[PDB]
Design a protein around this motif. Structure first.
Motif, PDB file in Angstrom:
ATOM      1  N   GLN A 191      -5.890  11.108  -0.357  1.00  0.00           N
ATOM      2  CA  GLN A 191      -6.150  10.945  -1.794  1.00  0.00           C
ATOM      3  C   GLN A 191      -7.000   9.701  -2.062  1.00  0.00           C
ATOM      4  O   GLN A 191      -7.874   9.714  -2.925  1.00  0.00           O
ATOM      5  N   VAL A 192      -6.740   8.629  -1.318  1.00  0.00           N
ATOM      6  CA  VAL A 192      -7.536   7.400  -1.423  1.00  0.00           C
ATOM      7  C   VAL A 192      -8.990   7.647  -0.983  1.00  0.00           C
ATOM      8  O   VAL A 192      -9.933   7.166  -1.633  1.00  0.00           O
ATOM      9  N   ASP A 193      -9.175   8.396   0.101  1.00  0.00           N
ATOM     10  CA  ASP A 193     -10.516   8.805   0.537  1.00  0.00           C
ATOM     11  C   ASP A 193     -11.266   9.543  -0.571  1.00  0.00           C
ATOM     12  O   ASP A 193     -12.464   9.338  -0.758  1.00  0.00           O
TER      13      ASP A 193
ATOM     14  N   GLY B 174     -16.495   7.515  -5.928  1.00  0.00           N
ATOM     15  CA  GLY B 174     -16.910   6.278  -6.579  1.00  0.00           C
ATOM     16  C   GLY B 174     -16.044   5.853  -7.757  1.00  0.00           C
ATOM     17  O   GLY B 174     -16.488   5.098  -8.627  1.00  0.00           O
ATOM     18  N   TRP B 175     -14.802   6.323  -7.785  1.00  0.00           N
ATOM     19  CA  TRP B 175     -13.871   5.966  -8.852  1.00  0.00           C
ATOM     20  C   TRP B 175     -13.201   4.631  -8.573  1.00  0.00           C
ATOM     21  O   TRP B 175     -13.219   4.149  -7.438  1.00  0.00           O
ATOM     22  N   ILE B 176     -12.612   4.042  -9.612  1.00  0.00           N
ATOM     23  CA  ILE B 176     -12.037   2.695  -9.542  1.00  0.00           C
ATOM     24  C   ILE B 176     -10.525   2.760  -9.342  1.00  0.00           C
ATOM     25  O   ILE B 176      -9.793   3.137 -10.270  1.00  0.00           O
ATOM     26  N   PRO B 177     -10.045   2.383  -8.141  1.00  0.00           N
ATOM     27  CA  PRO B 177      -8.611   2.419  -7.869  1.00  0.00           C
ATOM     28  C   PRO B 177      -7.880   1.310  -8.611  1.00  0.00           C
ATOM     29  O   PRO B 177      -8.439   0.231  -8.823  1.00  0.00           O
ATOM     30  N   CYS B 178      -6.643   1.583  -9.003  1.00  0.00           N
ATOM     31  CA  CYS B 178      -5.800   0.589  -9.637  1.00  0.00           C
ATOM     32  C   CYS B 178      -4.349   0.949  -9.390  1.00  0.00           C
ATOM     33  O   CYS B 178      -4.017   2.124  -9.260  1.00  0.00           O
ATOM     34  N   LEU B 179      -3.493  -0.058  -9.303  1.00  0.00           N
ATOM     35  CA  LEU B 179      -2.061   0.171  -9.174  1.00  0.00           C
ATOM     36  C   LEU B 179      -1.335  -0.284 -10.435  1.00  0.00           C
ATOM     37  O   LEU B 179      -1.710  -1.287 -11.051  1.00  0.00           O
TER      38      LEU B 179
ATOM     39  N   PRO C 259     -11.216   2.304   1.724  1.00  0.00           N
ATOM     40  CA  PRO C 259      -9.883   2.894   1.548  1.00  0.00           C
ATOM     41  C   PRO C 259      -8.752   2.008   2.075  1.00  0.00           C
ATOM     42  O   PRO C 259      -7.674   1.963   1.472  1.00  0.00           O
ATOM     43  N   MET C 260      -9.002   1.301   3.178  1.00  0.00           N
ATOM     44  CA  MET C 260      -8.006   0.399   3.772  1.00  0.00           C
ATOM     45  C   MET C 260      -7.581  -0.729   2.835  1.00  0.00           C
ATOM     46  O   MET C 260      -6.419  -1.147   2.842  1.00  0.00           O
TER      47      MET C 260
ATOM     48  N   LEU D 161      -5.038   0.793   0.438  1.00  0.00           N
ATOM     49  CA  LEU D 161      -3.770   0.946   1.153  1.00  0.00           C
ATOM     50  C   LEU D 161      -3.050  -0.393   1.332  1.00  0.00           C
ATOM     51  O   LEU D 161      -1.833  -0.468   1.204  1.00  0.00           O
ATOM     52  N   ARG D 162      -3.810  -1.451   1.602  1.00  0.00           N
ATOM     53  CA  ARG D 162      -3.240  -2.795   1.715  1.00  0.00           C
ATOM     54  C   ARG D 162      -2.665  -3.311   0.396  1.00  0.00           C
ATOM     55  O   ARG D 162      -1.658  -4.025   0.401  1.00  0.00           O
ATOM     56  N   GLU D 163      -3.291  -2.944  -0.726  1.00  0.00           N
ATOM     57  CA  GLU D 163      -2.754  -3.319  -2.040  1.00  0.00           C
ATOM     58  C   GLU D 163      -1.488  -2.545  -2.398  1.00  0.00           C
ATOM     59  O   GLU D 163      -0.592  -3.096  -3.045  1.00  0.00           O
ATOM     60  N   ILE D 164      -1.408  -1.279  -1.988  1.00  0.00           N
ATOM     61  CA  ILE D 164      -0.171  -0.515  -2.163  1.00  0.00           C
ATOM     62  C   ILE D 164       0.982  -1.232  -1.450  1.00  0.00           C
ATOM     63  O   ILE D 164       2.061  -1.436  -2.030  1.00  0.00           O
TER      64      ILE D 164
END
Lengths: 140, 140, 140, 140
Positions: B29-31, B37-42, B86-87, B90-93
């Motif tokens: 899903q992260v890939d 080109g979307w902006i990930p956020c937690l 992507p890594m 995953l590190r922020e999760i």
């Protein structure tokens, strides 16, 4: 980047973002009150009456704007009219906190010319309170 | 005929009706986020702030339509603008869930052209949560 | 200066600000009812139904003025019409409090000419109640 | 005079004022359903969803008239259309109560000509229920 915690991080208005006030720092705030001729007063509340809430609005029509329960606390004795002795104020803080050891207690001062509270800060929180963070645990 | 249970069977929007996501499935899903080109956020919330509720409507006139409390959660740091690794996500999760081990945590992604959240799913629920079912116990 | 406590200091209308009534004092109030030809009655409520509340107003428009839940208590048997014997009233107090040892129980009297309750005071509170103060602990 | 208790004396509509139905009495009610060609159905609810409440009205204007939460329960499977065998109904009661041993469970029946529920009574309450009196303790 540090993250400001949303969990059990309740505040208490003026000075709550600073390290807790030492006895010397409280005495200095009392000196300020006296130097300016303001009227000191103490107020207290049990834990359930300490923070702003909405319960009374159940009785309302559309008139809740700027209405909150728990803004009023209970007055310790009377405002100390004509008091010019800081030691007298400190002695009342001791007396109030001793009579109500499980209550939140705040020290306030009034200006009678503007007719408004001119200062205020918490001097006691119950030892059972678990809804606040120490300074160094506010962010993670 | 199997009966869908109404008891302790709370869901969590996208992907909550599937088997829980494996680390490989989360990474996939992260890939997808990065490939587009979307902006990930937690985002995270304590258990009491996790599900939609109505409490603030006590203050309202007849204006509750599409108002709910607890839609907003708390942002972990900032959205990861310009992130193409992507890594790093995953590190922020790992970092977020470590700092808040008892919180609900969800991964979201934003599209700045549509200006809307384009994806989202839960990555952590507190171990003390008792209000959900295993996939095979959703019907009895 | 003594400070009237706001904590666990709930009252119960007529006679609550006096020392608790002795059996002799209760008997004297019963005599007063009988001497005046009023109709004695007993009423009781479980702790959760004892004090005025607002919960039903969730169902209202802007019509809560002078509406409160828990004003009505439950009638013990019937009002004692034609009762000319104070001992009969005292016996019913014993019977009522025996049947409901954990209830609030109050003695009331009605005037049928004015058609209004003409007297009333609490005769029993549950032994588990902790929301009240004895007279000597009302101020600190 | 006996006094009808207001404490933990919750009822459950049709037949709740009679002695609890024996297995023979339940079987007789099922024969009645089948004899009249009505459609048997089972419904169930967790304790918190069993009795009528008001919570959703927090979201309303002045439109709460004849609105209550918890009137709807959850359907066990589907209504038993074309069922002419009482034993089949009794077997579903067993199956339903087995699957949800801590739930309230009621047997209902529908008439499709009037399009209305034509019968209904409780067949199970949770063993942890403490809000009801046995028939001999309903009055004191």
């Amino acid at each position: 980047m540090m993250v400001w915690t949303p969990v059990n991080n309740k505040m208490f208005e003026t000075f709550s973002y600073l390290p807790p006030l030492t006895d010397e720092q409280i005495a200095a705030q009392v000196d300020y009150i006296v130097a300016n001729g303001w009227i000191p007063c103490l107020e207290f509340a049990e834990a359930d009456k300490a923070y702003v809430s909405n319960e009374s609005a159940i009785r309302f029509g559309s008139v809740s704007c700027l209405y909150y329960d728990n803004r009023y606390w209970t007055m310790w004795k009377l405002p100390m009219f004509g008091c010019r002795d800081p030691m007298q104020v400190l002695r009342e803080i001791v007396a109030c906190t001793k009579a109500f050891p499980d209550a939140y207690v705040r020290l306030v001062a009034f200006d009678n010319q503007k007719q408004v509270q001119i200062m205020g800060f918490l001097v006691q929180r119950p030892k059972t309170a678990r809804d606040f963070q120490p300074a160094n645990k506010r962010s993670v």
